[PDB]
């Protein structure tokens, strides 16, 4: 009944429509700040000199962009990894030119997303649940840290972090492929396997369960109405489902334990995405994808090209063109 | 060789700008997310059906009872995310629907690309950019990337065309 | 920008026609129960 204990009891209340909690005390403000700055910047920010060469890039709808091309542009290469809050600019005009909003947004968003993961632990504890949903979310979150923070740290500049835009996302991944040959990096390969496999297993599980729903409805009503929220009996027949799938492959390639199955559903995409986050995070330190350029030669010493050499030709075309006015010296070392 | 196929479609077809590819991407990533989030949820709303710390044992494939609480799961997600599933049948049908729809969509885009019916350009951007040498978007920047890829990769990747591009014709930024 | 002027009625009907169909179906569901 003490004033502070009342607040604490509202903060952690399980009766709030959205749970707040202590992580949320940090999450609500920082996500609001990021979201509001992003919406306003995407609509009306002026062009930003992302590569520090006084070559401003237009990213906002009002300066001639559409939904697909718009972006909040990374902060200037001239700033590097220096901290550029508003109060470090002579004016907002200056802060806008140099890409300040990008820094504001990504730092609030990363904080708020980190607190999002904590909030997931927290409500799990208040509800008497098991704790590890937040561990699944650590896969996406690590991935956002990679492209917004870790990769910029290793390369020396937030100007090489992922733009907050659809086409800027594509620019990022093209230039990443030329500087790192990410496709030939096994951790990207595992992320593709986590993501293709996750979609595969998503479809598999949804079709196998859907295949074995027990008749509870007529032809003239959605079968969904055969399940009622909080019924204790299962709504499908997993032994029927196991019997189909194990004959489709063979018996011991099918789960008959629901707990193992759902754990597998959780594990496979989470872990492939961990690795692909780790892939971006280690290419931040230039441990790049496999290089088989000129690996095959004939008896004389002629190069015999492989598909890796063909990849290299593409990579070269990306290398020589990107940031076309920004290099004065022959090697693009960062 | 497939990696090469991906890169071909960027330089020549600008396939990332295709809204049918984009819906495929949303389907594949949406499915992977559904997969991880549904497995995690089930595993973290398990009923205590045994005394052991390995919870796997505490399932019997023939039991009629749901092995996890749909009600606690629904409260959790309603309060974390605002909305949550309430119908296990819709849930599982949604998991079928999303990745299957996504892949069908991308198949359609590839049909278009059989004809070079690409989502290559935005006409309004090119008109402005041609008239205004200070107009630059991430859209214009990626097309220069595409142009690097085409000129640098086509002689070797299309040997039958006998392309010879002298050094002076290769598009190149400064220094590199 | 020199956009396609029909892009606007293309977009307006694209939103409007399917949305109205869902709204019609939902309101007549609610006044059944």
């Amino acid at each position: 009944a003490n004033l502070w204990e009342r607040f604490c009891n509202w903060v952690t209340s399980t009766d709030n429509r959205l749970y707040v909690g202590w992580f949320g005390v940090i999450m609500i403000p920082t996500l609001l700040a990021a979201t509001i700055c992003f919406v306003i910047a995407f609509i009306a920010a002026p062009p930003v000199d992302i590569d520090g060469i006084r070559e401003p890039v237009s990213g906002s709808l009002l300066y001639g962009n559409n939904i697909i091309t718009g972006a909040v542009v990374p902060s200037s290469n001239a700033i590097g990894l220096h901290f550029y809050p508003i109060w470090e600019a002579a004016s907002l005009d200056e802060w806008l030119y140099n890409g300040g909003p990008y820094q504001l947004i990504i730092f609030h968003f990363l904080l708020g997303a980190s607190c999002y993961m904590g909030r997931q632990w927290e409500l799990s504890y208040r509800l008497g649940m098991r704790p590890w949903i937040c561990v699944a979310y650590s896969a996406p979150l690590a991935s956002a840290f990679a492209v917004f923070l870790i990769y910029p740290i290793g390369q020396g500049s937030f100007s090489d972090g992922m733009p907050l835009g659809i086409s800027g996302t594509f620019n990022f991944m093209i230039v990443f492929q030329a500087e790192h040959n990410i496709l030939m990096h096994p951790f990207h390969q595992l992320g593709v396997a986590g993501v293709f496999g996750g979609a595969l297993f998503c479809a598999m599980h949804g079709s196998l369960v859907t295949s074995s729903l027990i008749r509870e409805t007529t032809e003239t009503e959605s079968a969904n109405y055969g399940y009622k929220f909080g019924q204790e009996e299962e709504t499908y027949n997993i032994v029927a489902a196991h019997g189909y799938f194990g004959r489709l492959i063979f018996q011991y390639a099918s789960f008959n334990n629901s707990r193992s199955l759902h754990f597998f559903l959780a594990a496979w995409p989470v872990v492939g995405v961990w690795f692909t986050a780790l892939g971006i995070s280690t290419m931040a330190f230039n441990l790049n994808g496999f290089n088989f350029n000129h690996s095959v030669i004939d008896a004389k010493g002629n190069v015999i090209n492989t598909w890796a050499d063909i990849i290299n030709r593409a990579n070269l075309g990306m290398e020589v063109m990107h940031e076309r006015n920004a290099h004065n010296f022959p090697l693009d070392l960062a | 060789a497939i990696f090469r196929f991906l890169l071909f479609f960027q330089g020549f077809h600008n396939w990332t700008l295709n809204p049918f590819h984009m819906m495929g991407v949303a389907g594949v990533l949406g499915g992977a997310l559904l997969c991880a989030i549904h497995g995690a949820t089930v595993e973290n709303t398990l009923f205590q059906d045994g005394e052991g710390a390995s919870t796997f044992r505490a399932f019997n494939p023939t039991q009629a009872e749901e092995t996890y609480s749909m009600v606690t799961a629904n409260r959790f997600w309603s309060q974390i995310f605002g909305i949550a599933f309430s119908n296990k049948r819709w849930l599982h049908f949604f998991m079928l629907f999303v990745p299957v729809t996504g892949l069908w969509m991308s198949a359609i885009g590839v049909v278009g690309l059989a004809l070079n019916l690409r989502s290559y350009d935005f006409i309004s951007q090119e008109i402005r950019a041609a008239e205004d040498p200070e107009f630059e978007t991430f859209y214009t920047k990626n097309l220069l990337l595409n142009e690097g890829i085409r000129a640098w990769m086509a002689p070797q990747d299309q040997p039958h065309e006998n392309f010879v591009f002298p050094e002076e014709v290769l598009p190149r930024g400064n220094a590199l | 920008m020199e956009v396609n002027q029909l892009g606007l009625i293309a977009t307006a009907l694209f939103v409007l026609v399917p949305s109205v169909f869902l709204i019609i179906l939902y309101v007549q569901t609610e006044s059944q129960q």
Binding site: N66, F229, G230 | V71, G82, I83 | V3, G7
Partner: peptide
């Protein structure tokens, strides 16, 4: 006009978010 269209559609989705959260069909046990 194209800017207005984009922002209008965005605005409509945000409003839809609000109704789907706060004016959802409430889940009722059985």
């Amino acid at each position: 006009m194209e800017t207005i269209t984009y922002v209008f559609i965005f605005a409509c989705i945000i409003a839809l978010f609000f109704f789907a959260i706060f004016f959802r069909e409430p889940p009722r046990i059985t």
